[PDB]
C-alpha cells in the first residue's frame, strides 16, 4: 500500500510493483557508487560548505548512501518521482529518512572541530 506524499516534490535487484507504484529494492550483486559531483551536492544539502569545511565531507560520503532504517523503502510514483515509504506504519516523505540525522551530525561535528 505505498502512496507518494501529497503534492509535488520540492525539486535480488528487480523492483516490486504494488498497484501502480514501484518499490525499489537493493541489488546485492553490485554496489552503486555515486559521483563526486553528487556527493558535493548532497554535502551542501545537509549544511556542509565543501570549500570552507572539507573536514566535514566524510559525513556527506557516509550520509549519501546511508541504508534506510527499519522498513523504509524507496518508491517511485507513476510520474517518476522518488519518495520513501515506511512499510511499518504507512508514513511517506520525499526526503531520505536519514537526511535529518546527518544534518544534525554535521552540526555536532562542526562544533567539535571549533
Amino acid at each position, epitope marked *: 500500500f505505498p502512496r507518494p506524499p501529497p503534492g509535488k516534490p520540492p525539486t535480488a*535487484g528487480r523492483p516490486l510493483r504494488i498497484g501502480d507504484q514501484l518499490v525499489l529494492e*537493493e541489488d546485492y550483486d553490485e554496489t*552503486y*557508487i555515486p559521483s563526486e559531483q*553528487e556527493i558535493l551536492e548532497f554535502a551542501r544539502e545537509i549544511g556542509i560548505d565543501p570549500i570552507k569545511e572539507p573536514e566535514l565531507m566524510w559525513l556527506a560520503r557516509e550520509g*549519501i548512501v546511508a541504508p534506510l532504517p527499519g522498513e523504509w523503502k524507496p518508491c517511485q510514483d507513476i510520474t*517518476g518521482d*522518488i519518495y520513501y515509504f515506511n512499510f511499518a506504519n504507512g508514513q511517506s516523505m520525499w526526503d531520505h529518512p536519514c537526511d535529518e540525522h546527518y544534518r544534525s551530525l554535521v552540526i555536532q561535528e562542526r562544533a567539535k572541530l571549533s
Partner: nanobody
Amino acid sequence: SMGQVQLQESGGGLVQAGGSLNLSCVASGSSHFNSMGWYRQAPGKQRDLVADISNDGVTNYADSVKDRFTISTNNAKNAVYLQMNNLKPEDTAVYYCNAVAVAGRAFSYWGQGTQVTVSS
C-alpha cells in the same frame, strides 16, 4: 567517478498518424541500474510512465501504449530503447528516459527530453 551519469536521448521527430518512431538513450559511465523507464509529458499535463524495464527484462506498459510500444535494453552498452508503432496524435509529448540505481538512497537520473510529434 567525478561527473554525474548523464542520459543522452535521441530519436524524437515528426511522424504521421500510424507511422513508427524509435527512441534511444545511452547512459554515460558503466553504472548498473535497477530500473530504466520512458516517461512522457504534454504541456500542462503530468509526466506519466510509458514503459519501464527491470534489469532482468521484466516490463510494464501503460494501458494506452501496450501492444504498440516496446521497451528493451542492452546493458552491455548501458542503453535503453523504445519502439513505437501505430503512433496516434495523443502520443505527442516530450519523452524522457529515466534510470534508477539504489544504494540505500535511490539515485534517479533523467535524460534531456526529446519531443515526439504525431500529426493527423
